[PDB]
Design a binder for this molecule. Sequence first.
Ligand SMILES: *[C@@H]1O[C@H](CO)[C@@H](O[C@@H]2O[C@H](CO)[C@@H](O)[C@H](O)[C@H]2NC(C)=O)[C@H](O)[C@H]1NC(C)=O
Ligand SMILES: *[C@@H]1O[C@H](CO)[C@@H](O)[C@H](O)[C@H]1NC(C)=O
Lengths: 100, 119, 43, 187, 71, 40, 282, 50
Amino acid sequence: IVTIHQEPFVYVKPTLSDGTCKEEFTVNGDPVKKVICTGPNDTSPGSPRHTVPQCCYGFCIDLLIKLARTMNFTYEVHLVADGKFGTQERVNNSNKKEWN
Amino acid sequence: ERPFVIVESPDPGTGGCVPNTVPCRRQSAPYTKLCCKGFCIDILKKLARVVKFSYDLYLVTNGKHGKRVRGVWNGMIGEVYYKRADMAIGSLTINEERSEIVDFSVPFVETGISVMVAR
Amino acid sequence: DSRSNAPATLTFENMAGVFMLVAGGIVAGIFLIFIEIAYKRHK
Amino acid sequence: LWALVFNNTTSKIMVLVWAFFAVIFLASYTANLAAFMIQEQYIDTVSGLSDKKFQRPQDQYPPFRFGTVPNGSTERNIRSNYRDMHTHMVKFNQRSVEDALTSLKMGKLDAFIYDAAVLNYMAGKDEGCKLVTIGSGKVFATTGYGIAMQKDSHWKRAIDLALLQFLGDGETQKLETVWLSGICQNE
Amino acid sequence: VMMFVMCLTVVAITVFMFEYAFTIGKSVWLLWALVFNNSTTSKIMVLVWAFFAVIFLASYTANLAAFMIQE
Amino acid sequence: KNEVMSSKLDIDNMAGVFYMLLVAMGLALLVFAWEHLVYW
Amino acid sequence: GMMGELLSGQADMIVAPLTINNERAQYIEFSKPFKYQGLTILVKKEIPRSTLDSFMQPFQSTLWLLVGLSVHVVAVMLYLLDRFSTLSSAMWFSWGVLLNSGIGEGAPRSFSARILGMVWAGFAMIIVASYTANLAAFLVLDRPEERITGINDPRLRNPSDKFIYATVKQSSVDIYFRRQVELSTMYRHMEKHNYESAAEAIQAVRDNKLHAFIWDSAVLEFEASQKCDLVTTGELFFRSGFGIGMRKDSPWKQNVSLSILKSHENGFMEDLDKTWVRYQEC
Amino acid sequence: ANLAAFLVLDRPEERITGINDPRLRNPSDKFIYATVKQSSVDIYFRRQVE
Ligand SMILES: *[C@@H]1O[C@H](CO)[C@@H](O[C@@H]2O[C@H](CO)[C@@H](O)[C@H](O)[C@H]2NC(C)=O)[C@H](O)[C@H]1NC(C)=O
Ligand SMILES: *[C@@H]1O[C@H](CO)[C@@H](O)[C@H](O)[C@H]1NC(C)=O
């Protein structure tokens, strides 16, 4: 599964050194659900790369869970490479137009 | 004249410049390409489908609008009095001196002389 | 919430400009009423 | 009683009523004058071509500075009649609308004269809404734009009727509100 | 609060510059009474402080004329 | 429709100023008996 | 009508306020316009009620008497507190300090009495301060108090018997509403109240019989700025011109259409304006 | 009365309408408009001809 960092839907937060991520309940008392999301260089604009782990949680990620518990999935979530949502552009050599 | 007939370079990517625009050569071998748009232009388009024209354009150079100089006209009025064109659209005003040698249509935008100062 | 109630509240700037007027009253008179007092009193 | 009355038995009850009529009058005064000064219309220097400040520029202070981009049409109307106005008008601006507009924000001149339909447009869009036309919309020697066609053509009668079709159906109103539109218009 | 307390100082100083008569208690009634209307030592300060009321007391009015027209 | 002016009768605005207004008598009630043991 | 007696052959020229539009442009050969104008509505003025009525405007008659009575209570609140430690004069002490005049008498004595008097002055100040403000905003915002504006969904939308719209039969204005199908409602009413002469229908507006008149702007601006007591609602919603007329195939066509232009340059058409369409204001 | 007129005509802000305001159409310098690149919106503004 691929995703993208968007504020009110799916969050990206650094991992605790102990490998896990912090678990603070909601106001309703129920425990928040979170999953380990791998992904990009941890610093996007200028760097070769650093594929480091993260911890994600949010609206969609929750909808991912319930859907899973009704389909018997097994998922590995990773952020998208270059952040952009996606469109098709006519690259150089004018021959093929691919979806960036 | 900036609000009525505008000129703009073509889209280097697509090659043939954006629709809703009319291509317009420039009188002067490599005659440079650039396409026009604006109010007075959008008239002759809607005017073309009602009387069934076909048309080219070309921005005149020698003189701005047209006046008399020692017995010969320049500018747009020059390009109509000397059989080098059939119309001349854009920001052109009616008066007496012009309308003696070249016919005119009915005024479709009204104007005059005005005065402008600071606030 | 959305409110944007009252297109003002008189700043603590112009009143200072008003406060400056009375301040000059406090500073000025005493110096005159004290220093010049030595003159008109004795002779 | 009146001396007592203007701002410091059946005898005293009347001068009271006068004291009353003070605050009712005064408050009504300061109110009225508020609405009168909250009406934003202010006089602008000149009031037409016929005015003296244009006609005979030999006043003590330097004349209004007269900019007209030359060799156009407004020239051929001024030179034709007002000999004195023209011979003073060789000090001008020569970079058309752009020169006139900057030179006027920076005090290089004080008056400008040009075709009407581009002036009350350029003044339509302008940072801060800091320009106007002294006519309050007035126009002089009013004429209009046209389509110059060869003399005695056969094309004339056709596009002469396809124009009167557009104005007479408001289809030209759709254009005028797309290309001639300003922020400063309704303010 | 500033106008409340900055008023309260001209209450204090003026009885000091006048006691050296006017009752200590008495001086307090007149000044507030002054800023509210109704009653070279006493005069010099009370003169300009009197207008000082008229200056802002008239702006308050002007302010309400805005808060009642731009809403 | 042409009724816009909005002349305001704000009885609560009035009830606003009446707060410091009537309690002035409430400042007297607390100063009416406070004088009797004081004058005695 | 008038366009007929030219096309039939009874006269060779028509010098009158004739408009310019497509239909007549088929059969007549116009000239260059010699005046520009529009279309605008004429309505009867609305009265600026009075001063005496406005002087009580923020006096909404609710607090106007709630305070008119509460002035009395403090009077009987001090002497009834003063008699416990004169009364008739205390009733002359409120109505003075309230109106801030110097029409009073001896002041209250007790320290408590001093506290009581002082707040009354404070209450008084806020009242007149509130009054002078509320009246001002009552004068700016209640500016228009005007009749219907231009035609943007006013009472024009419903052909009730509250409003009556009129024109003159056999005009451009009449035709102009017929071809417009987007305004079908606007015309079905207009048929029932059309008039016969532009002059007699003006009289109807000065007679509370006719509410709105939709006619030219040149004739109908002089008509307001000169007669009196009549005003035109807003801007104009159409733009046209006038012009001489002449039959097809006329020799004069080319020549007269120069003079009309040649005179716009010489300020001639300007002064004819300054002669008898302006400088006649009410 | 003259103080009040000045305080009334200090009109702070009349920011914007929807996307039809003349501030939108003619972008001289004031009110520059910016979207996220390559997004579904930046294509919607290339497909509408107006
Ligand atoms: C319109 O006016 C012009 C100018 O006056 C007329 O041209 C003149 O016509 C007369 C008639 O024979 C000639 O003798 C003149 O020589 C013409 N002028 C010039 C400069 O040559 C013209 O005739 C007028 N139009 C009509 C229909 O009479
Ligand atoms: C204007 O007309 C004069 C006269 O022909 C000419 O010399 C000049 O180059 C023209 N343009 C400008 C900008 O003055």
